[PDB]
Design a protein around this ligand. Structure first.
Ligand SMILES: CCCCCCCCCCCCCCCCCC(=O)OC[C@H](CO[C@@H]1O[C@H](CO[C@H]2O[C@H](CO)[C@H](O)[C@H](O)[C@H]2O)[C@H](O)[C@H](O)[C@H]1O)OC(=O)CCCCCCCCCCCCCCCCC
Ligand code: CLA
Ligand code: CLA
Ligand code: CLA
Ligand code: CLA
Ligand code: CLA
Ligand code: CLA
Ligand code: HEC
Ligand SMILES: CC1=C(/C=C/C(C)=C/C=C/C(C)=C/C=C/C=C(C)/C=C/C=C(C)/C=C/C2=C(C)CCCC2(C)C)C(C)(C)CCC1
Ligand SMILES: CC1=C(/C=C/C(C)=C/C=C/C(C)=C/C=C/C=C(C)/C=C/C=C(C)/C=C/C2=C(C)CCCC2(C)C)C(C)(C)CCC1
Ligand SMILES: CC1=C(/C=C/C(C)=C/C=C/C(C)=C/C=C/C=C(C)/C=C/C=C(C)/C=C/C2=C(C)CCCC2(C)C)C(C)(C)CCC1
Ligand code: OEY
Ligand SMILES: [Cl-]
Ligand SMILES: [Cl-]
Ligand SMILES: [Fe+2]
Lengths: 30, 27, 137, 334, 244, 442, 97, 33, 37
């Protein structure tokens, strides 16, 4: 149960990276 | 003394700058 | 505390006699011990055979007793095993083996007395640290 | 329109969301190999005989470890510096007992990170930038090379490289202190100066700029909405910052030139970390931190201890305990 | 031809015992008077078999095969010792010395590691009576000693040992100690093993022999922490005989 | 354009002042080699091993066969004096040339002579100067061969009877051997070219290298670069600097490992034992001592269950036990007499260890390359008494450090060369910022 | 029922004399003329049933016998403890300094 | 392993409660525009 | 030790190897003399 918890949190961080890179707030000039 | 010789040697370089600048050469 | 004549008074032989060294001889000997012996014997141990050390009590149970100037001078000439049963000049530095241990070549007789005197004095100064190893560092 | 020219054009394109490039062509596969092997082994690898004494060490979550204690464990001392790819093992079981994943991960990783550094040069050229961001990154890259490759080379074994784990990292640095005394080594001290100093200048520069933001917002909104990405005008008043900081110390201890300031910010930590990387790398060949053990003695010859001797007592305690079943002879010469 | 170190190094051949030619169907005759030593005895395992535990009553567990995970580090070699002739014609080999142990760990299905001290220490092995010649039908049967896989200085991962180490679970200061007795008190086992050596080849001229061996012994018990498994080793051997 | 702290960059297009900078700097090199040898000889006590004396240059001269006899004993110090004096004197002549060309000589060479003048962008002239220097180096390599074969030989730590100066009459020519080393894995038990372990292969490889260098020199005099090379490279002074910084970095790294692992062209007689050697020596030392007391070293089970003194490598070879199991690829003259075909031979161990090998083992275990920055010998926890740091650590560490900064210098100047060649080394043209003319990524 | 057999042995003569069947060979440095030669002989020819058996080692010179007699009272014998004599531990028990 | 039984719910809420708070705030931000 | 005929120059030779270091220092005297032009 501890193993599943660690891998779950790790996997959520990877998903988050995917969203943060590809579904970011596009930076727009002024 | 080894402190004697490394004094005559260490003064050489700065003496070259000194002579050249008070004779006003290509520095 | 300081390096007094009591400290510097060590046994000359097993009969009972004593010689009193000078500060000069002592610092002389320490210096030659570093040149010729500390690579194996730093601190009074023996790196290449730690079961044998330079503690005065160990030397006194050596055959030929070695806890005196003469024992030690002799050992530096014609070393033996601890029971005196075999000469070991071929694998231990000594004047007899100075062809194969070149550092022993320039050791005069008085150099030997200094070295031997340092060996006997140091345990009087450092106590257990002499020959005790890393436990006492 | 030529097929290879088309491929060369996509490879080096500046329109890809993530730049590939020629360095990226090595980086991508090598980092995926290292990453995928690391994640699998961190979760599920069985115990590894790191010191070659048939004393396996459990590193993975499934074998009783948590996040803090887990590691991918270094390859066996029996292997030394020998190359241990999977195909040199009789079986994956053998490879796992003997530590083969550690080699796969660190060699792919070092390659891929080296290319990461090349990639930074390369995108800078395609964008018309100056080129030296990659020189900055070479400080951490060198540091990774030191703990994963150089130190194992000098000591003769990947079993003494840094574990890929949090507690394994600590084991590494404790045993390093006992065998080298990194703390008394000047190149580590510059590392500390590099890293303390960089955190300091990080905070200063951040506090000085924030202090001198030009009022562009109300109290109800984040000051951050006063900068618009790509605006031409600076967003703070460097003369107000210089006037503040010059008075806090004195005038000529404070920068008025933003280019010198930012170069200084780059140079300080990069250089201190270069040194600390070189410290690991030179203690790899046993040129160790200063030794002042028994350097002060009294007039009789008594040892008068110093803080350096107390350090030595600690170092001795680490020495006699580490790898407690692995030494048969009195000197731990590697 | 016999090879040099630099021919062998890194091949794995160093772990292989010498082989005899298939032509070698001789007989080495034994002068009951004269005495003989074994100059070299070499044992190469090829197969590690471990006995399972069958859960319930006399369901008689089997010997199941295992994967070697410790590589080409298993052979015994340079073993030497008296080869005697007894009153009754039997030959008895008494081991004296040699590289006569190797630690091995093998892996059973499911992943369990089984370490063992593959050994013939103190081997005494004896033919049938009235040998008079060693031949491709001669059998040596013997027993040997299997000391603890770890010796007395071994420290377990929490600092506990037999001739050294802590005597308690120092990380659990006020735990009840009786549950921990078996882990806290290390003991040193010394068991017996059995070997059969079957000569299948003989060079009458040279006095070399080779063949096949089966031995049975116990695996490591982790200084009494858990119960051992019975192991069976199969492999090939090589000896050379010399007049005393 | 350049600041005082980038002041040497002002010489890029002044071939005359740049010739002077190079020649005066070559004088500093020859000067150091000269003074330092004389400093080492002034301090040299012949009854002490060289490696107890902080000597790094004298061992280089001894290894070339001068000054020494059997076993590495020093027998005649006059060749060490000579090598220092000659270097020393020759530096004045380079220094003279160097300050002449930097201060008074023609500031640019091209007006004075079209032979010595160069423009960095002239691909033919640059390949021609490269051609000349390739030949010089070819000659240098053959000087090593000439010494080995016609002027005394070289020191051979492997020569039977303790090592000795030996003339080399059958150099290895077989390209399979010589280029075989270039193809060996750099990993353990393999060593790439750092494993070279006999002088025949050393001398043979240098014949090859000298021929290849002379042929390439001639090739590069007679050719101009092909179009694939022309389009692949930047052609500028700073770019050529960057290429050479890359190469010296690589070579520095190689030399690091060579002085750390190799005991043929760095004889341990002179340089002290390698790390692996000293570790193997300790296991030998205690095997010898315990066997003398009655221990059966082949049958002693150690705490882990592996042999206390002897175990098996992963490919089966009988090797020393304890942590030095990592060092079983070590080969050395005091230890090979105990090796048979299966690794270390138990009957040779039991019967044929000589005293000289006992002495050498003890000597090397107590002179391992461990010590402090302030030259306290040994592990970090040892007390002051022994003033020793192995030359092998001094040379390994120093050349690691230099190699690393030259790789940094390689990156520095390569990226700058690229940016200068395309014209944005000074920054981004506000009126033509390339990103502002690209589509956005999202 | 689980005892540490090395600790038990410390409660016998082993814990106060040189035990001819169990003690590591370095201990013979404690008395005069016993190490290395006689200590080598004594360890090789263990075990012994009484202390006095040491004198029936073939090869002793009469001076070796005399040395042993001067030291018989520093010797004891107790049952061989497997844990103290396996692994070659009578020659090297992992203790140095 | 003999781990603390309440570690799980401690962890689940430590993730869930703050994360949910941010998600509420973000979603109602996005639907202002 | 140097040949006896050169013994007089022992203390000069003990100082000689530091001289290349002194050329580095010298470039900074020169540049202070011209104002780091
Ligand atoms: C994000 C953007 C980028 C996109 C990238 C692409 C996305 C896709 C990502 C790929 C993710 C891959 C995940 C890799 C899993 C690796 C599995 C492994 O290694 O698993 C391998 C398995 C494991 O094998 C078994 O592995 C076991 C290992 O057991 C261990 O593990 C067990 C648990 O399983 C227990 O713990 C056990 O006790 C322990 O010992 C035993 O050793 C068995 O004997 C052994 O057979 O083997 C098998 O059969 C393997 C089959 C190969 C057999 C060899 C035949 C030769 C073929 C070589 C194929 C090369 C591949 C082609 C390359 C390219 C082609 C163009
Ligand atoms: C063959 C080697 C080589 C050569 C010929 C050059 C040549 C050049 N370099 Mg490069 N460089 C090199 C190696 C080399 N470099 C290395 C190895 C690095 C990485 C460390 C660099 C990093 C580098 C940078 C960052 C820059 C140059 C620049 C330049 C140009 C001007 C340099 C100058 O005026 O220095 C003037 C010399 C000094 C200011 C003194 C340097 C002081 C050093 C750092 C102290 C070292 C002290 C030492 C460790 C011990 C001291 C002991 C004590 C007792 C005194 C010039 C073309 C500049 C450039 O881009 O121009 C185009 C520039 O900005 N160099
Ligand atoms: C090995 C190191 C080295 C070398 C060989 C050079 C060489 C050179 N530099 Mg660089 N430089 C260096 C290090 C070096 N530098 C460092 C560390 C810095 C940082 C401060 C600089 C900064 C620098 C700047 C800022 C400039 C140069 C320039 C020059 C050139 C002209 C100097 C001049 O006008 O002299 C003027 C100086 C003098 C007349 C003073 C006298 C110095 C003499 C030569 C000392 C010799 C003493 C010696 C014991 C005599 C032996 C004689 C005997 C053998 C016969 C010259 C080729 C200049 C250049 O490129 O010109 C376009 C230039 O602008 N250099
Ligand atoms: C580049 C290679 C190199 C190497 C490996 C050595 C190595 C050695 N030298 Mg030599 N030396 C060198 C260059 C080199 N030196 C140069 C260029 C000079 C002229 C300054 C000298 C001048 C010199 C003298 C005068 C003496 C030595 C001595 C020694 C020994 C003791 C070193 C010591 O305690 O340093 C102490 C460590 C430091 C000072 C640390 C410096 C760290 C720097 C600042 C970091 C640099 C980073 C950048 C480059 C050692 C065997 C001594 C000896 O035993 O002679 C027989 C001795 O007395 N050397
Ligand atoms: C690689 C170094 C190098 C290079 C490329 C040059 C190049 C040049 N020099 Mg300089 N010079 C150098 C080193 C160098 N020199 C040195 C070391 C000194 C001091 C000895 C001088 C002193 C010097 C002066 C005083 C003058 C020049 C002049 C010239 C120009 C004409 C040379 C010529 O045709 O002379 C004719 C060439 C010869 C007679 C060559 C004969 C063979 C030589 C001497 C021996 C070669 C052997 C070998 C390769 C190296 C020595 C062996 C040693 C390693 C043991 C030319 C630009 C002249 C100039 O431009 O002034 C306006 C000038 O007057 N040079
Ligand atoms: C200082 C040495 C030196 C330098 C700087 C050069 C420089 C050059 N050479 Mg010359 N060359 C030399 C020595 C040198 N050469 C010698 C001695 C020979 C005789 C064999 C040659 C033969 C030669 C030929 C025949 C040609 C050149 C060409 C060129 C140009 C292109 C180089 C290029 O693209 O290679 C970069 C390298 C590659 C593109 C291929 C990589 C191959 C290596 C072996 C990969 C291995 C790297 C590995 C990681 C390191 C370990 C080594 C491994 C073998 C173990 C360039 C001007 C070309 C040219 O235009 O001629 C006019 C050409 O066709 N050179
Ligand atoms: C601080 C400056 C410095 C100093 C003092 C040193 C000092 C040294 N280096 Mg290092 N080095 C440095 C910077 C420095 N280096 C840098 C920046 C790099 C690049 C990263 C290197 C890369 C490097 C390598 C790759 C190697 C060294 C090596 C060495 C050592 C030997 C040098 C030698 O013999 O050259 C060789 C000399 C020459 C090339 C000059 C010409 C010599 C001729 C050809 C010799 C002819 C001899 C012949 C037999 C005569 C026979 C004639 C017969 C007929 C009578 C020496 C201690 C060597 C070493 O020991 O490493 C452990 C080595 O392999 N260095
Ligand atoms: C510098 C000249 C010395 C001096 C004065 C001594 N040693 Fe050594 N030592 C070494 C070894 C391996 C032994 C044991 C020999 C044996 O019995 O097998 C010794 C022993 C001694 C003793 C006797 C100590 C005792 O308790 O009886 C003495 C007095 C002694 N040494 C003095 C090893 C080494 C070395 C290893 C290379 C070196 C060097 C030296 N010793 C140097 C010296
Ligand atoms: C071999 C020989 C010789 C030669 C020699 C020579 C070659 C010398 C030279 C020398 C030199 C070459 C010298 C130099 C020196 C210099 C110096 C002494 C320096 C100083 C410096 C300083 C001190 C600095 C400072 C500063 C400044 C200025 C500014 C900035 C800051 C600072 C602080 C850094 C002779 C002749 C003797 C003869 C015999 C032998
Ligand atoms: C350019 C320049 C520079 C540099 C320079 C240089 C680098 C220099 C060089 C110089 C040199 C490089 C010098 C050298 C010299 C040398 C000499 C001058 C020599 C002499 C010697 C002698 C005298 C010897 C003698 C003897 C003998 C014979 C025997 C033994 C003893 C004796 C040693 C005594 C600088 C940066 C500063 C600045 C800028 C410019
Ligand atoms: C002497 C000797 C020897 C021999 C050796 C030899 C013979 C060597 C060789 C060497 C070699 C023969 C080398 C090679 C090298 C190469 C290299 C190092 C290369 C490089 C390359 C690069 C760098 C490239 C780059 C690039 C790319 C990739 C892409 C395009 C662009 C460019 C071009 C940039 C021996 C060991 C036997 C022994 C001892 C002594
Ligand atoms: O430090 Mn102490 O030294 Ca380098 O090895 Mn010997 O012991 Mn072991 O295995 Mn990793 O650690
Ligand atoms: Cl540890
Ligand atoms: Cl060990
Ligand atoms: Fe900023």
């Amino acid at each position: 149960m501890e193993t599943i918890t660690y891998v779950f949190i790790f996997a959520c961080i990877i998903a988050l990276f995917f969203f943060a890179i590809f579904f970011r707030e596009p930076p727009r000039i002024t | 003394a080894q402190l004697t010789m490394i004094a005559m040697i260490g003064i050489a370089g700065p003496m070259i700058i000194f002579l050249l600048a008070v004779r006003r050469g290509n520095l | 505390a300081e390096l007094t004549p009591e400290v510097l008074t060590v046994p000359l032989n097993s009969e009972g006699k004593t010689i009193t060294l000078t500060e000069k001889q002592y610092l002389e000997g320490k210096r030659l011990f570093q040149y010729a012996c500390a690579s194996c014997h730093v601190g009074g141990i023996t790196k290449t055979n730690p079961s044998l050390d330079l503690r005065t009590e160990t030397l006194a149970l050596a055959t030929p007793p070695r806890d005196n100037i003469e024992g030690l001078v002799d050992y530096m000439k014609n070393p033996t095993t601890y029971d005196g049963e075999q000469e070991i000049a071929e694998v231990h530095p000594s004047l007899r083996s100075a062809d194969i241990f070149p550092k022993m070549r320039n050791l005069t007789e008085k150099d030997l007395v200094a070295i031997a005197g340092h060996i006997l004095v140091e345990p009087k100064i450092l106590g257990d640290k002499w020959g005790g190893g890393k436990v006492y560092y | 329109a030529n097929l290879w020219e088309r491929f060369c054009n996509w490879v080096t394109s500046t329109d890809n969301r993530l730049y590939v490039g020629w360095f990226g062509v090595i980086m991508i596969p090598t980092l995926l190999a290292a990453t995928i092997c690391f994640v699998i082994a961190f979760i599920a690898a069985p115990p590894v005989d790191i010191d070659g004494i048939r004393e396996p060490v459990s590193g993975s979550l499934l074998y009783g470890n948590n996040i803090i204690t887990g590691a991918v464990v270094p390859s066996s001392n029996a292997i030394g510096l020998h190359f241990y790819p999977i195909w040199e093992a009789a079986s994956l079981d053998e490879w796992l007992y003997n530590g083969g994943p550690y080699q796969l991960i660190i060699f792919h990783f070092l390659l891929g990170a080296s290319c990461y550094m090349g990639r930074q040069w390369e995108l800078s050229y395609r964008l018309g930038m100056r080129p030296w961001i990659c020189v900055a990154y070479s400080a951490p890259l060198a540091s990774a090379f030191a703990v994963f490759l150089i130190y194992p080379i000098g000591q003769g074994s990947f079993s003494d490289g840094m574990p890929l784990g949090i507690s394994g990292t600590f084991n590494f640095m404790i045993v390093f202190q006992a065998e080298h005394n990194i703390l008394m080594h000047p190149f580590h001290q510059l590392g500390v100066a590099g890293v303390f100093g960089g955190a300091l200048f990080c905070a200063m520069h951040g506090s000085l700029v924030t202090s001198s933001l030009i009022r562009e917002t109300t109290e109800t909104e984040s000051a951050n909405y006063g900068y618009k990405f790509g605006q031409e005008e600076e967003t703070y008043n460097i003369v107000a910052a210089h006037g503040y900081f010059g008075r806090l110390i004195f005038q000529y201890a404070s920068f008025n030139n933003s280019r010198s300031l930012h170069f200084f910010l780059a140079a300080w930590p990069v250089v201190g970390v270069w040194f600390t990387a070189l410290g690991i790398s030179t203690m790899a060949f046993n040129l160790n931190g200063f030794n002042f053990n028994h350097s002060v003695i009294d007039a009789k010859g008594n040892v008068i201890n110093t803080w350096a001797d107390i350090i030595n007592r600690a170092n001795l305690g680490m020495e006699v305990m580490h790898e407690r079943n692995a030494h048969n002879f009195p000197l731990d010469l590697a | 031809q016999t090879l040099t170190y630099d021919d062998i190094v890194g091949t794995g051949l160093a772990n292989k015992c010498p082989t005899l030619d298939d032509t070698a169907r001789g007989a080495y005759p034994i002068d009951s008077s004269q005495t003989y030593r074994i100059a070299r005895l070499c044992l190469q395992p090829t197969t590690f078999l471990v006995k399972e535990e069958p859960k319930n009553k006399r369901q008689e567990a089997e010997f199941v095969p295992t994967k070697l995970v410790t590589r080409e580090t298993t052979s015994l070699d340079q073993i030497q010792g008296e080869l005697k002739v007894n009153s009754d014609g039997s030959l008895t080999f008494v081991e004296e010395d040699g590289i006569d142990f190797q630690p091995v760990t093998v892996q059973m299905a499911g992943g369990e590691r089984i370490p063992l001290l593959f050994t013939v220490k103190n081997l005494v092995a004896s033919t049938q009576p009235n040998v008079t010649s060693i031949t491709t039908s001669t059998d040596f049967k013997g027993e040997f000693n299997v000391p603890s896989y770890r010796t007395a200085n071994f420290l377990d991962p929490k600092g506990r040992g037999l001739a050294s180490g802590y005597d308690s679970a120092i990380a659990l200061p006020q735990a009840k100690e009786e549950e921990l007795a078996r882990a806290n008190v290390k003991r040193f086992s010394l068991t017996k093993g059995q070997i059969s050596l079957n000569v299948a080849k003989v060079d009458g001229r040279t006095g070399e022999i080779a063949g096949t061996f089966e031995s049975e012994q116990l695996s490591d018990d982790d200084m009494g922490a858990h119960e051992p498994h019975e192991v069976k080793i199969q492999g090939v051997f090589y000896a050379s005989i010399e007049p005393a | 354009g350049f600041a005082w702290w980038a002041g040497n960059a002002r010489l890029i297009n002044l071939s005359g002042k740049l010739l002077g900078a190079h020649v005066a700097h070559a004088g500093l090199i020859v000067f150091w080699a000269g003074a330092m040898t004389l400093f080492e000889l002034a301090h040299f006590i012949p009854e002490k091993p060289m490696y107890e004396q902080g000597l790094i240059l004298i061992p280089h001269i001894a290894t070339l066969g001068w000054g020494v006899g059997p076993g590495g004993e020093v027998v005649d110090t006059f060749p060490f004096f000579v090598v220092g004096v000659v270097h020393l004197i020759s530096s004045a002549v380079l220094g003279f040339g160097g300050v002449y060309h930097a201060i008074r000589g023609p500031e640019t060479l091209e007006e004075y002579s079209s032979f010595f003048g160069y423009d960095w962008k002239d691909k033919n002239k640059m390949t021609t100067i490269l051609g000349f220097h390739l030949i010089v180096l070819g000659i240098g390599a053959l000087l090593l061969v000439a010494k080995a074969m016609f002027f005394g030989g070289l020191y051979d730590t492997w020569a039977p009877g303790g090592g000795d100066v030996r003339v080399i009459t059958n150099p290895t020519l077989d390209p399979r051997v010589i280029f075989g080393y270039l193809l060996k894995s750099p990993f353990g038990g393999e060593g790439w070219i750092v494993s070279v372990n006999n002088l025949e292969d050393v001398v043979g490889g240098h014949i090859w290298i000298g021929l290849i260098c002379i042929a390439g020199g001639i090739w590069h005099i007679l050719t101009t670069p092909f179009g694939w090379a022309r389009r692949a490279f930047i052609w500028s002074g700073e770019a050529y600097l960057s290429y050479s910084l890359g190469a010296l970095s690589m070579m520095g790294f190689i030399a690091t490992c060579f002085v750390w692992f190799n005991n043929t062209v760095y004889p341990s007689e002179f340089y002290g034992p390698t790390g692996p050697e000293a570790s193997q020596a300790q296991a030998m030392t205690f095997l010898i001592r315990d066997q003398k007391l009655g221990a059966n070293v082949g049958s002693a089970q150690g705490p882990t269950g592996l042999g206390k003194y002897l175990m098996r490598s992963p490919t089966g070879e009988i090797i020393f036990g304890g942590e030095t199991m990592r060092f079983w690829d070590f080969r050395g003259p005091w230890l090979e007499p105990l090796r048979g075909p299966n690794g270390l031979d138990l009957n040779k161990i039991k019967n044929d260890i000589q005293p000289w090998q006992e002495r050498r083992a003890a000597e090397y275990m107590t002179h391992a390359p461990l010590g402090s920055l302030n030259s306290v010998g040994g592990v970090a926890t040892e007390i002051n008494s022994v003033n020793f740091v192995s030359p092998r650590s001094w040379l390994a560490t120093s050349h690691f450090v230099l190699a690393f900064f030259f790789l940094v210098g390689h990156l520095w100047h390569a990226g700058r060369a690229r940016a200068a060649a395309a014209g944005f080394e000074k920054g981004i043209d506000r009126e033509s910022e390339p990103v502002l003319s690209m589509p956005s990524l999202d | 029922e689980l005892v540490n057999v090395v600790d038990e042995k410390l409660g016998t003569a082993y814990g106060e004399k040189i035990d001819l069947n169990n003690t590591n060979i370095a201990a013979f440095i404690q008395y005069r003329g016993l190490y290395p030669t006689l200590a080598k002989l004594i360890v090789k020819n263990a075990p012994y049933e009484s202390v006095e058996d040491v004198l029936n080692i073939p090869g002793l010179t009469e001076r070796q016998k005399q040395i042993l007699r001067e030291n018989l009272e520093h010797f004891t014998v107790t049952e061989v403890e497997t844990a103290l004599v396996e692994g070659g531990d009578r020659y090297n028990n992992g203790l140095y300094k | 392993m003999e781990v603390n039984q309440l570690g799980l719910i401690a962890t689940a809420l430590f993730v869930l409660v703050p994360s949910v708070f941010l998600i509420i705030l973000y979603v109602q931000t996005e639907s202002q525009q | 030790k140097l040949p006896e005929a050169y013994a007089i120059f022992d203390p000069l030779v003990d100082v000689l190897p530091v001289i290349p270091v002194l050329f580095l220092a010298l470039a900074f005297v020169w540049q202070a003399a011209v104002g780091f032009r």
